[PDB]
Symmetry: C4
Subunit: 94 residues, 4 copies
């Protein structure tokens, strides 16, 4: 379960890096904005302060969402249970 | 489980096609924009760069969301477990 | 399980009616817009074409979200499994 | 299970307080707006009527989302099952 969290962590970083490069290049976003936008998209927050304006970007975003949402939320879940859960019990133990 | 993924795949395409035709026609979106908007709606990202402006479109969107979200996320889940999960183990096997 | 879907259905309608009255009155939205906005909020789509502008509306929305999201998605889930799932098998049976 | 709901409740308040202070200070939002924005972010509604404009705010939001979404939805879930579920059965009992 310690290995679980480490595999999900790597795959999320790779997914986020892919988005940062694509949106920086094709949509012209500053890299920090491209990373921020990729995160806001794949967690489904979707503020819309940034959104793709090219047809290439729209098509990429469709696939990016379908491929990436399941991995990011897996990671959030494992981060929730296998890392954030115990530490709270640890601060409780009398 | 191989058949699971294929049924969910077909139903998602049909749902997305329905949205593309409706929003292209009633809301006047280019078909690519209508497909992109349908995806962004049913994954709950909801950037809001497009949104329905007619009352017909608003009513359709209410039903579209309730009917379609469960199918799309089912598919994302099965895509997550029955397709994207193994391949990662497959790249790990020593 | 037939009764499950009927209880969730009633509670969702009541939740949506509550939102429609509140946002129509305090935020001044047309009733159709208030219902549409309530749905878009509680499914977490959140286009932002409408959003609360008064402090009362912002506070109500915080509570509305926390109280209402769990019920709406329960209903979507049961609609997914106890109504939309079988009919697809029913169209498949050879 | 009564204790479950009380631990999740405290942690959600702490998470929301952290966001309110940060966005009030660094992004200049009125405290009520900062709390409202923190809630809309961590439930993934994401209207985008407010969104971070500084690079510090964008970076904080990335971490805030990853850390906070799992806790908020845990709480919503337990609020759904261990508090909102029974009371409805209680109003049904013949
Ligand atoms: Na940058
Ligand atoms: Na097109
Ligand atoms: Na109306
Ligand atoms: Na305030
Ligand atoms: Tl969402
Ligand atoms: Tl959104
Ligand atoms: Tl959203
Ligand atoms: Tl938005």
């Amino acid at each position: 379960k310690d290995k679980e969290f480490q595999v999900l962590f790597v795959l999320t970083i790779l997914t986020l890096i892919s988005g940062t490069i694509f949106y920086s290049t094709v949509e012209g976003l500053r890299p920090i904005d491209a990373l921020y936008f990729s995160v806001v998209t794949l967690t489904t927050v979707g503020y819309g302060d940034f959104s793709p304006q090219t047809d290439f970007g729209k098509i990429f975003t469709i696939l990016y969402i379908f491929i990436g949402i399941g991995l990011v939320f897996g990671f959030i879940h494992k981060l929730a249970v296998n890392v954030q859960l115990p530490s709270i019990l640890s601060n409780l133990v009398p």
